[PDB]
């Protein structure tokens, strides 16, 4: 629609596309099955959303208050851009970097930014896989190592930190992290954390050695186990006492939060995470299909499973939250009961309490810790705590705790590993297009150079301050960069390449111009939605102050949270993690208009 002079003789002609399939058997890789491609897309979509981010924000926003805005934006901004990406990859027979180069020469920043974002998110997501496998390794003991507290040197009392907090909190912050008080205080490379990091990047190399060939045979177990195990955790989930109390809690959504731009922003950025959009590893994966494959039907199947697994994950999460909250509620009423009995020597139930204490009333000397199930259900764990603090504790109060531990951390590994496969494709392929290495070198080399270079960069997260880094990195890695990239893909396919051209080629491939649904979502609605969520980013950034949670035991309220402001140097780390990728799109565009 805008000036794009010389678009042919930069893009395969539709007349040539029939003649470019049978000849290109060599020099470009091929999916063994249709299923082996659909698994690799689902794996990259279900593993990059549900390995961590999705289950967190659901519990961090109360559930329905996040799920509602999510499923609205999954259909209006998700489905369109997932269809667009599958279609444009299958037509231009290039990965993400080739597609935006062919469409327009100065549109290189898009493909580059997609490679930077894919690199950045995969860097700290393999640390989370390292953390996951640490727990997995520590999950083969009748007493789970986080089930009890360590003793003093005298062994006359439990460790102070572990007493003020919980065995679970201690295993996370001390036994695993050995966390320091601030991002400033950065100690040595925690050795046991480095072994797990090595183990993570290594198994990644083992599965992405020759590329889609070797990964295609990995995604059978990796894309299927998370499911089989997620269903086992539903049957066990719903047998837990507090489940169907917490399930009911996600279905009764907070509306006050529905009026916050924060809830909509986090729901927005999660659509681009749950659909693996603007990472550009899906474009590359659709670029190995037949030119006449139904890429409209694949997008709808993948999206329907992605929307269904979100709800199926929120159910398995709120089962356990409910169970936990019931446990804490009962253990509180029991204590409130013990105090009265131990001060009056009484015969007291969860029912005859308010009358009981009333008639009983020394009463002043007694202290009763007020508590209701609602407050327990509302408790939000921050960070990675839903796996390492909420699930890991609930597992210890479930018989076959060790099984429940190994099943849960294998399904989180699988989910994280299948996410890494698509993140590896969004950095490896754009390098092969740039011809960074000499062509003679095999695939194993480039892959290995990338597997070792990042593994070295992953040492920042094995420090004592290592957890704060992964926190802020994520905060600015999957935010604006994805929003911007995702908006520019929608804009550059419809207003630069022409939606009308885009409608004719799809018609070549599937035999029909897409439904008016697609037309309205692609021309007007999705770009407008992506603009509203792009402002909401700056609306929530201004009012909030740059801060973060620290785990200082010496802190007066050590158990209570401690939100300190980041140092003034951190804005150097923020301006690069978010600005560098987001500015490569204008930056290269300007550079190409002056060359």
């Amino acid at each position: 629609v805008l000036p794009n002079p010389g678009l042919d003789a930069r893009i395969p002609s539709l007349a040539e596309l029939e003649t470019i399939e049978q000849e290109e058997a060599s020099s470009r890789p091929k999916w063994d099955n249709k299923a082996q491609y659909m698994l690799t897309c689902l794996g990259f979509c279900v593993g990059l959303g549900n390995v961590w981010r999705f289950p967190y924000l659901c519990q961090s926003h109360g559930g329905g208050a996040f799920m509602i805005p999510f499923l609205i934006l999954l259909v209006l901004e998700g489905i369109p851009l997932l269809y667009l990406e599958f279609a444009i990859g299958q037509r231009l027979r290039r990965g993400s970097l080739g597609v935006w180069s062919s469409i327009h020469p100065a549109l290189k920043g898009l493909g580059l930014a997609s490679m930077l974002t894919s690199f950045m998110v995969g860097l700290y997501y393999n640390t989370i896989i390292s953390w996951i496998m640490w727990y997995l390794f520590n999950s083969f003991q009748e007493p789970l190592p986080w089930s009890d507290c360590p003793l003093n040197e005298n062994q006359t009392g439990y460790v102070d930190e572990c007493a003020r907090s919980s065995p679970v909190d201690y295993f996370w912050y001390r036994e695993t992290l050995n966390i320091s008080t601030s991002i400033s205080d950065s100690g040595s490379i925690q050795w046991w954390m480095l072994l797990c990091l090595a183990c993570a990047w290594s198994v990644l190399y083992m599965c992405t050695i020759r590329g889609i060939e070797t990964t295609g045979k990995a995604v059978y177990i990796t894309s299927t186990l998370p499911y089989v195990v997620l269903t086992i955790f539903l049957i066990r989930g719903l047998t837990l006492k507090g489940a169907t109390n917490g399930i009911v809690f996600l279905f009764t959504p907070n509306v006050t939060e529905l009026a916050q731009p924060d809830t909509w922003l986090d729901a927005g950025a999660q659509v681009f995470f749950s659909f693996s959009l603007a990472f550009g590893g899906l474009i590359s994966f659709s670029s190995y299909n037949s030119v006449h494959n139904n890429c409209e039907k694949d997008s709808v199947i993948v999206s329907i499973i992605n929307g269904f697994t979100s709800v199926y994950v929120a159910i398995v999460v709120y089962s356990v939250i409910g169970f936990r909250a019931t446990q804490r509620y009962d253990d509180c009423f029991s204590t409130n009961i013990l105090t009265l009995i131990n001060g009056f020597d009484l015969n007291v139930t969860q029912e005859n309490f308010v009358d009981m204490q009333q008639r009983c009333n020394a009463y002043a000397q007694l202290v009763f810790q007020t508590c209701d199930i609602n407050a327990f259900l509302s408790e939000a764990v921050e960070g990675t705590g839903l796996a390492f603090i909420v699930f890991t504790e609930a597992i210890t109060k479930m018989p076959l705790s060790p099984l429940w531990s190994v099943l849960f951390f294998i399904m989180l590994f699988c989910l994280g590993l299948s996410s890494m496969f698509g993140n590896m494709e969004g950095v490896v392929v754009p390098l092969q297009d740039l011809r960074v290495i000499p062509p003679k070198w095999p695939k194993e080399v480039l892959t290995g150079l990338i597997c070792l270079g990042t593994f070295l960069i992953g040492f920042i997260f094995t420090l004592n301050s290592g957890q704060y880094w992964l926190s802020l990195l994520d905060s600015y890695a999957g935010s604006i960069p994805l929003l911007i990239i995702a908006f520019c893909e929608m804009f550059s396919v419809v207003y630069v390449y022409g939606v009308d051209r885009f409608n004719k080629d799809i018609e070549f491939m599937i035999g029909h111009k897409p439904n008016i649904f697609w037309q309205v979502t692609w021309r007007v609605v999705s770009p407008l939605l992506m603009l509203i969520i792009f402002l909401f980013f700056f609306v929530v950034e201004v009012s909030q102050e740059l801060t973060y949670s620290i785990w200082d035991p010496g802190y007066e309220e050590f158990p209570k949270s401690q939100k300190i402001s980041y140092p003034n140097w951190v804005y150097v780390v923020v301006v690069i993690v978010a600005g560098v990728p987001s500015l490569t799109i204008p930056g290269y565009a300007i550079y190409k208009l002056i060359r």
Binding site: L136, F137, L195, M206, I209, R210, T214
Partner: peptide
């Protein structure tokens, strides 16, 4: 004896085996 170390030892060993096997398998491809 740390059970995590034994578990790691096994897993890290198994991965290496795969890795070398894959390298030679590709080299074998001629």
């Amino acid at each position: 004896v740390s059970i995590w170390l034994i578990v790691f030892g096994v897993v890290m060993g198994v991965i290496v085996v795969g890795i070398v096997i894959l390298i030679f398998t590709g080299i074998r491809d001629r």
